[PDB]
């Protein structure tokens, strides 16, 4: 390439003025809001040196008619009239340029469209809107190739761990052309650096073209190349299908430049100085301050009406983590907080799940969690919904160009995508306001699932900013799924934080510039995940690594959750308590993974600082990618080593909520992923102190040991992958008030003692033991006489109907019972040997080997008693008992909660009399059935269906069968045809078919096809050596009937007491009648619904006999 030239500048017709602070002077054109040049400390940066007196309005070139006024020494104002009759533009905008110390602010302060436009109303011609405003062509700041050290550095979005989003371009003549959008951009010489911010929600496309709030352009002027940074175009009045969006979607255009000399004392001026200064002018995502102290993120899941994780139970998990981490902050995302659980009832944000304890228990969880620094978030959806939802309506549904529905996912029900732009234009905001009104204060974050993938149409930068603003306005922090989503407003990205998702092309933001700037504000980055290579091969700043133990994707591994917190997240979070000040790359390395061999340039040293001038230095131990030392770092704090390789001894000076700890609560955490002694220099304020070590377990601080300090050092030779904490004085563990609000003390056996139970019988026969998943349970075994454990149920309401269950897995033939005595009445329920394995994936005691009870299986099922308090609730007792037996019964999770069922002879209480289940008042699950093994351990596709006429019922979009047969609820199975396996069954603890007695079992049912489902009678444990079943295939209910059919069966209890009934998925193919795909799923060909179950003990007489 040859030396380039362009027109020189003739400014003979130009009148310049100057505005200035004490440190920065800007020469500005009186004809147009353009900065020609900046001066600071005798150094200069050009702005837009060549006049370009045009703007683009709705993509039309306009020469504005401009009048000017200098307002004061720092501020000038421009009135800019905009007219283009041919394109229906008739408007004016006011712009101010203002110097604020070393910042220049560009603000459009007023916009007037002379066309009639009313936000929220129809507009007959959208071209009359003033929808976009572009000052592209006027650089806010630039640098010339004639200046020493001229360079541009910019970040674009990359989520591919192999590919940096950053460009580092020397500004030379000649140089390659440049006309490119950026998220962040800096120009610098060897004397000054500048960074540019804009609130522009411009996009030039997806991927690296998105979030492009800036545009950088090379312009050749005389014999110099300039690279200038421009704001990208701004948005203003917009509409969808002629309906103008609400006023709150309009945000006045704004941009800022900041100009700095050396800002990290390294005696070089470069983009890093610009990035430090940029923090003073940038947007900050709402809630960002909380991020650095949320060390323990995880999901607690509910699904399919099961109430796996009631709100008050999550509080016990929080207390376990509070003990085990010694008071680190937590963030629990409630996936399934609403409706029947996860992926039920979407869009109705205010519909807080009733079966997990409703708004009352959610409020209690939020309030009581505060003292543990545990913040709650909820999972919502703004992209797809189901017929059951209050907000399912034809008008909101997304349709394809051919008029067909844009179907969403099918699981419990068939979802349909919604049109997000329509939704915004028709009251979406009010749904968030309803939730805020119902729930009140204190919720931390909203995680909006899916958004960004285009299911609901446009989910780009502008639309996301609007959505985030709705959420932030209620006082909530924004979180989203994708590495590329919500770059402007998000504080958490699930595909960045869970390193296992999506593979190497789908992770966090792979940009050193962006991470430099914002590391401390969000979990949006590339974390350590060696098999993705590139940036993921041991990032020096770490990066959030999320695991779970409360049911999400069947995750139950509590111990692995805790070790991962300490292996990745403690140091990640430590660094977020500082801001990055310096970033040094090493030499390129060659890596091979994921089908490619590629070059990668790694960070070798990162420095961070805080407002107290603490200095952290993080150094990679080798640049050699094939050395073990490439995946090791040292960390120093003011020169003192706090991490080296597999071990750290890190100070922690913040409580669970991030507040500064008092001196006597200052601590250090030790963790080593390897065996071996390590030696550490103590800081001066520890070196002459006594020092005590504690091993951290789910019981808190244990195994107190005073350490020997020698020469101001300590040596630690402790268990690998085990957290410890150190203090300068003896510490104790506080009272946890286990299970507060749940009417019983320590419902999950987490407190390490049984002393709060009154034990009758031989107490040595009752112990707390760990499941195969380390879940503590009550075990009773080897007892020759009855053993009982009793507590009062406390805090109950008088004259109130309740349910109580305990999870029970009984390996003994002995009677294992739950008994409630209200003071006035006693009710009892029991099980002999358990016969149904647990197949609920989000439930902690399902039968997956790694959270099995014992012998690699779990038969846990909830065992209920139903009772009513009288006038006095001072002496209501709950007793767990086990009659004599050699083998073990396991109990866990005692849940007492209001319930208004009337299942026993039309009365609430456990008692005799005809059994009826109308499904209208189910405590949880599908009682008296439990889910069977048809799908193995799964988020079972059987749940309680909720009525929403007409959408859930026959006829809507050709639906063949009703979701709900009578009342508001039925028992629905979705699409489980041709599986040759058991869908669900009664178990004797739920309904016992007494030995030698005969019962009439009646129910109403819908079935979409003939003989796809069968009513079955079995006994004992079902085996798919396959068990004998009495088989009654059921015909479809719609080809020859306008409603559910009634079925009736006689069943005599086997002498072994273990008879049950259920619904079985046959081997027969279903019939979708020529329909396919979404229509076939929606219309219910493959579905089965039950309602109005009745089981009546009878004596066979007359024609019953035949
Ligand atoms: C194409 O299947 C994948 O994506 C769908 C959504 O379009 C599902 O998320 C699916 O995961 C499955 O989700 C259901 C609940 O909807 C259930 O939780 C299953 O355990 C889970 O496999 C996902 N992957 C698949 C089917 O492998
Ligand atoms: Ca510097
Ligand atoms: Ca437990
Ligand atoms: Ca019903
Ligand atoms: Mn449903």
XYZ file of N, CA, C and O and ligand atoms in Angstrom, residues 748-750 775-777 845 892-893, ligand 3:
37
model
N -35.065 -31.271 57.946
C -34.193 -31.987 57.009
C -32.989 -32.663 57.653
O -32.103 -33.167 56.934
N -32.946 -32.661 58.989
C -31.898 -33.373 59.774
C -30.497 -32.836 59.532
O -29.535 -33.601 59.434
N -30.407 -31.499 59.494
C -29.177 -30.756 59.187
C -28.391 -30.273 60.390
O -27.314 -29.714 60.229
N -26.931 -36.636 51.861
C -28.102 -35.945 52.385
C -28.433 -36.620 53.722
O -28.628 -37.827 53.761
N -28.471 -35.840 54.805
C -28.671 -36.393 56.142
C -30.123 -36.784 56.314
O -31.000 -36.061 55.876
N -30.359 -37.952 56.908
C -31.692 -38.535 57.034
C -31.757 -39.159 58.402
O -30.713 -39.550 58.954
N -34.257 -36.816 46.676
C -34.171 -38.256 46.981
C -34.753 -39.123 45.858
O -35.375 -40.177 46.129
N -36.983 -38.311 55.997
C -36.361 -37.003 55.774
C -37.438 -36.054 55.294
O -38.320 -36.490 54.555
N -37.328 -34.779 55.702
C -38.213 -33.713 55.238
C -39.634 -33.812 55.806
O -40.515 -34.476 55.229
Ca -32.017 -34.246 54.761
